Design a binder for this molecule. Structure first.
Ligand SMILES: O=C(O)c1ccc(Nc2nccc(Nc3ccccc3F)n2)cc1
Length: 263
């Protein structure tokens, strides 16, 4: 069992509504990790305790290269602490703001990485991971890690979309006040891919109700440059009916994936 003084604390990597993630290192081994700090006073207000409590339980059990590993958890009085894997390269979000778009090789690789994570997660009976770029981190060299977990944290940047970066990634079934099956995730995949190539999500709009309009009615159009295998994958992924959406492995199999995927 750990405690706060077992750790040296660096800068905040990102600041959230319930707390902050700090760069840290265990004092003895001098091994660097990321410490999520949860103020716990917003935690009651927001009515989230027991959930989080079993969430550390679940995510404790998740081992994947494309999933950020939760090493441990502890708490004191005012704060809960998640001891996390450190991802040196930061957010795919700032990367995407850097380049303004990715290419098909990068994109295809990220998408297979993600598909593996979600496939793994499903086999572990875990659904509805938050895969929007803000929640995705970059490991040692290029590798892509799903952060999720602690409700969303940001490093200072852009400013533009703050949130209201929200439902672009929400599926019609979720937004529409209904339940969801594992297939929720494959909608996000579609959206992600689009963004990667385009630089913006397919449903982006200057009002919430209009974004909704486009999502639930699945109204989205490709710029000239998007290749059609890309189009096929995306169109195949974004379907009002969950049942018409591919299974993950089918996604990995997709011809365009295999074509440009470095993995
Ligand atoms: O800003 C940067 O250069 C930067 C941001 C993050 C980072 N690595 C990391 N590792 C593990 C967890 C974690 N939380 C987190 C922090 C901020 C936003 C989103 C996050 F999910 N962030 C490295 C650099």
């Amino acid at each position: 069992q750990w405690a706060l003084e077992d750790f040296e604390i660096g800068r905040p990597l990102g600041k959230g509504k319930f707390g902050n993630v700090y760069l840290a290192r265990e004092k003895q081994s001098k091994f660097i990790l990321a410490l999520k700090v949860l103020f716990k006073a917003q935690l009651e207000k927001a009515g989230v305790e027991h959930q989080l409590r079993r969430e550390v339980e679940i995510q404790s059990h998740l081992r994947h290269p494309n999933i950020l590993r939760l090493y441990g958890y502890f708490h004191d009085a005012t704060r809960v602490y998640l001891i996390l894997e450190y991802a040196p390269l930061g957010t795919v979000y700032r990367e995407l703001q850097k380049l303004s778009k990715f290419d098909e090789q990068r994109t295809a690789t990220y998408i297979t990485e993600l598909a593996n994570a979600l496939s793994y997660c499903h086999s572990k009976r875990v659904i509805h991971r938050d895969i929007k770029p803000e929640n995705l981190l970059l490991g040692s060299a290029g590798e892509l890690k799903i952060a999720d977990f602690g409700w969303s944290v940001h490093a200072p940047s852009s400013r533009r979309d703050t949130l209201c970066g929200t439902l672009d990634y929400l599926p019609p079934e979720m937004i529409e006040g209904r339940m969801h099956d594992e297939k929720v995730d494959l909608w996000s995949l579609g959206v992600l891919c689009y963004e990667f190539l385009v630089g913006k999500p397919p449903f982006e709009a200057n009002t919430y109700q209009e974004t909704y309009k486009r999502i639930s009615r699945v109204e989205f159009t490709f710029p000239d440059f998007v290749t059609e295998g890309a189009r096929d994958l995306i169109s195949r992924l974004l379907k009002h009916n969950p049942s018409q959406r591919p299974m993950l492995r089918e996604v990995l199999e997709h011809p365009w994936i295999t074509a440009n995927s470095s993995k």
